[PDB]
Amino acid sequence: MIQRTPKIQVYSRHPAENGKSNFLNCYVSGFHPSDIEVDLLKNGERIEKVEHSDLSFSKDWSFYLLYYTEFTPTEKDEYACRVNHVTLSQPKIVKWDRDM
Amino acid sequence: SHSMRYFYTAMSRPGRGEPRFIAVGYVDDTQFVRFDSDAASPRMAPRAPWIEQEGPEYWDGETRNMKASAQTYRENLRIALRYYNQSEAGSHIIQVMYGCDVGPDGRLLRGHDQSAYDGKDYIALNEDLSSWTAADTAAQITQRKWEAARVAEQLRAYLEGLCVEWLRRYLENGKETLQRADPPKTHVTHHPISDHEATLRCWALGFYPAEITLTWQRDGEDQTQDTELVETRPAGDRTFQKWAAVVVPSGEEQRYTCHVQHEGLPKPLTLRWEP
Amino acid sequence: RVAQLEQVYI
Ligand SMILES: Nc1nc(NC2CC2)c2ncn([C@H]3C=C[C@@H](CO)C3)c2n1
Secondary structure: OOOEOOEEEEEEOOOOOOOOOEEEEEEEEEEEOOOOEEEEEEOOEEOOOOEEOOOEEOOOOOEEEEEEEEEOOOOOOOEEEEEEOOOOOOOEEEEOOOOO | OEEEEEEEEEEOOOOOOOOEEEEEEEEOOEEEEEEEOOOOOOOOEEOOHHHOOOOHHHHHHHHHHHHHHHHHHHHHHHHHHHHOOOOOOOOOEEEEEEEEEEOOOOOEEEEEEEEEEOOEEEEEEOOOOOOEEEOOHHHHHHHHHHHHOOHHHHHHHHHHOHHHHHHHHHHHHOHHHHOOOEOOEEEEEEEEOOOOEEEEEEEEEEEEOOOOEEEEEEOOEEOHHHOEEOOOEEOOOOOEEEEEEEEEEOOOHHHEEEEEEOOOOOOOEEEOOOO | OOOOOOOOOO
């Protein structure tokens, strides 16, 4: 019956340069229980090739995972991470901001 | 000082097959092995370059131990249902973390073994490595069984023996990464929010280990209470990222300094926005 | 290397 909602950060592995290959990350942490659905979006649509790290947890027992995929940022393409979890009334979408 | 830690998660899923068992191992902030019962051919697998040199006896042996642990944890989920009078229809989770810490000379500093059931503390091996702290009535049942079966002595033998021995081996084999701090690459960005205010963001990228301090000062006065500081996050390449931001009145930007403290930096680092 | 304890039931 313990429940904790995920913390979400979306960001790139390296500082973004348009036309330069990179990795798009979505780091989800602080959640319980462990079932979680994470999608990376390009212009609102689900990216197919997404990998993730092995489920682990922090000292307070909350879980964390990193979802990632190779991508090439451009000026106009929008990226985001969409997360669903038992604690969430609707899936949460966090937009990628190259400045964050 | 250094540590080895293993993290096991066992999760039941009624009407979705047998419980999932996932185990990961770390040396310090570096993951080096994984086991997932939902992988195509379940086996302990390398996750750091310096463990890849391990031979077949290592991988076969760890895989055998992981498979046996998965079976034991599946039984433990069943036992927990009995202890707590819970239904077979709910999903439940066992989490266990254990391992050893050594000092710079390689001697055991401390051993660890603690667990949670459904996110609540269950039972933990005390620092004396000879007694248990049980959180509730259910865990007290386990405590008594474990005292009877001399479980603490067996775990103590591991923590003082094999755990320390292999941690030392891993630290030597991976010394070029595990014992060589990676300093952050740093920079300050500037983003106007209006004609009257701007965000200054101080970046620390590609550092290892994860421990770092990132602070803003105004006129040499600490601004921690007005700073947005994100949680340290994995870059995806075994290093870490963090940033700290302040919103400042336009015209004050050159009065603000970002201060970075990290093991990989010889001295405290101070940065400003360079227009 | 992981702990090698035999059938540790709770
Ligand atoms: N604290 C604790 N709780 C456990 N189980 C609980 C919470 C239901 C637990 N199960 C096994 N171990 C140790 C024995 C061997 C090591 C690897 O498995 C760990 C355990 N330690």
